[PDB]
Amino acid sequence: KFILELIETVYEEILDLEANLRNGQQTDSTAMWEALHIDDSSYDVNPFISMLSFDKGIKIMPRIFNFLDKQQKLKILQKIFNELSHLQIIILSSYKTTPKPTLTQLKKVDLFQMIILKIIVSFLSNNSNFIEIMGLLLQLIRNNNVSFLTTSKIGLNLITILISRAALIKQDSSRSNILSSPEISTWNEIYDKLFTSLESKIQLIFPPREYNDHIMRLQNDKFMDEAYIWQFLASLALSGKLNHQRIIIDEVRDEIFATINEAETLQKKEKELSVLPQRSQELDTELKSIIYNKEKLYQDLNLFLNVMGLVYRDGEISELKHH
Ligand SMILES: [Cl-]
Ligand SMILES: [Mg+2]
């Protein structure tokens, strides 16, 4: 393709950069940047966006990013948030639009998650200010079916990364009154724009059990791993007013009780395994696995419950006591 040639020239441009890095020369990504075709609108679909559809394109991204400055990194993120709704890996990771992913589609989703989102997190955590997060957030909000996005694992995680970083800086800055009025106001405007794009569709962040089942079989284990769903719920809740929080917890209340029920079932299985005398190692690894799964369900729900000042503990939801 025209995209494989681009990947080879980008790669060569990388090796060049590395030699100059290694030989103590100043680094210049100008040619690497050009080779990505980030501003190129000649084609139906941008060639850098197209490059993200290839495992190889994905796998060289950390080395590309090693040579970019912050302005270049930001520009790349901006490009990604504009094309999000029709970005392949989003379509691939939505249960709506890809209700039965194959193993290789899954591994692709994981690869993108493992590599691209890791880079995005490092970048935003080491190089970002409130206004840049706001802009990325507005941009996502303006240019996508945000709810559709939330049905995607990558899409949701991208929202959570942005939203938790914003909350974090606002928290670190609040301790000494850094952050202007126009910024706190804009965040509450932007937050409320995000919120209202999700209102009444929040539960659609949880995929159908059927879909969960299909995925469990492909990966060979009994494992809802939905931490990323609860992490999103926690961050969404953390930045809302009481009104926002009551709406949220009301909309996901069936999922809260299904998770509690899931946890209670594992707790019962744990008890009946625990009373058995002189177990074999295989029985004991069965027991350790049930315990771990039980604890993960606790910890994942409690992530969200804690933000509402609640805690699930021993079959009960009670008021979280910090003191
Ligand atoms: Cl630039
Ligand atoms: Mg309302």
CB 243 within 8 A of CB 308: no
What's the CA-to-centroid distance between 22 and ligand 2, angstroms? 57
Residue 197 CB contacts under 8 Å (≥ 6 apart), including other chains? 141, 146, 147
Which one of the ligands is nearest to 39 CA?
1
Tokens of 161: 């990364």
- Cα separation, 54 vs 318, whole angstroms: 48
Separation CA 57–CA 79 (nearest Å):
16
Task: List all residues 6 or more positions away from 302 whose beta carbon is below 8 Å from its beta carbon.
Answer: 311, 312
Provide the sign of the torsion angle of the four alpha carbons 202, 205, 208, 212, taken in this order: negative
- Radius of gyration from C-alpha coordinates of the chain: 22
What's the CA gap between 323 and 257, in Å, rounded?
A: 27
Closest of 239, 96, 228 to residue 165, by C-alpha: 239
d(CA 30, ligand 1 centre) in Å: 9
- Residues 13 and 36: their CA atoms lie apart, in Å, by 10
User: Which position has the token pair 């939330």?
Assistant: 150
Record the resolution, in angstroms.
Answer: 2.3
316-319 vs 310-313, strand pairing mode: antiparallel
Nearest partner of 140 among 202, 204, 83, judged by Cα: 83
Gap from CA of 284 to ligand 1 centroid (Å):
56
Which ligand neighbours the alpha carbon of 33 most closely?
Answer: 1
Cα–Cα distance for residue pair 253/245, rounded to 1 Å: 12
> 98 alpha carbon to ligand 2 midpoint, in Å?
30
Distance 61 CA to ligand 1 centre (A): 16
291: CA distance to ligand 2 center in Å? 39
Cα dihedral value 55, 154, 309, 126, nearest 10: 60
Dihedral of alpha carbons 264, 265, 270, 276, sign? positive
The residue count for the chain: 323
Among the listed residues 55, 58, 56, 77, the one whose alpha carbon sits nearest the alpha carbon of residue 68: 77
CB of 239 closer than 8 Å to CB of 163: yes
Residues 160 and 303: beta-carbon distance below 8 Å: no
Can you give the three-state secondary structure of the chain, one letter per residue? CHHHHHHHHHHHHHHHHHHHHHCCCCCCCHHHHHHHCCCCCCCCCCHHHHHCCCHHHHHHHHHHHCCCCHHHHHHHHHHHHHCHHHCHHHHHHECCCCCCCCHHHHHHHHHHHHHHHHHHHHHHHHHCCHHHHHHHHHHHHHHCCHHHHHCEHHHHHHHHHHHHHHHHHHHHHHCCCCCCHHHHHHHHHHHHHHHHHHCCCHHHHCCCHHHHHHHHHHCCCCCCCCHHHHHHHHHHHHCCCHHHHHHHHHHCHHHHHHHHHHHHHHHHHHHHHHCCCCCCHHHHHHHHHHHHHHHHHHHHHHHHHHHCCEEEECCEEEECCCC
Cα 74 to middle of ligand 1, angstroms: 9
Cα–Cα dist 247/85, whole Å: 26
Ligand 2 mean position, distance from CA 247 (Å):
7
| Ligand nearest, relative to CA of residue 244 | 2
**How close is the Cα of 75 to the center of ligand 1, in Å?**
6
Find the 158 Cα to ligand 1 centroid distance in Å.
Answer: 22
Q: Cβ(96)–Cβ(148) under 8 Å? A: yes
Half-sphere exposure of 214 (CA within 13 A, CB side): 13
How many angstroms separate the Cα of 154 from the Cα of each of 93, 204, 205, 302?
Answer: 7, 15, 12, 22
Cα 36 to its chain centre, rounded Å, is 25
Q: Among 213, 201, 216, 234, which residue's Cα sits nearest to residue 307? A: 234
CB 312 within 8 A of CB 302: yes
Cα 130 to ligand 1 centroid, rounded to whole Å? 20
**Which amino acid, one-letter code, is at 69?**
D
User: CB–CB of 249/256 below 8 Å?
Assistant: yes
Ligand nearest to C-alpha 78: 1
* Site of tokens 């315990």: 291
User: Ligand 2: distance of its center to the CA of 145 in Å?
Assistant: 19
| Experimental determination technique | X-ray
In degrees, to the nearest 5, what angle opens at C-alpha 160 toward C-alphas 157 and 165? 130
Q: Single out the residue of 139, 126, 134, 128 nearest to residue 184, CA to CA.
A: 134
Please tell me the distance from the alpha carbon of residue 31 to that of residue 34, in angstroms, as a whole number.
5
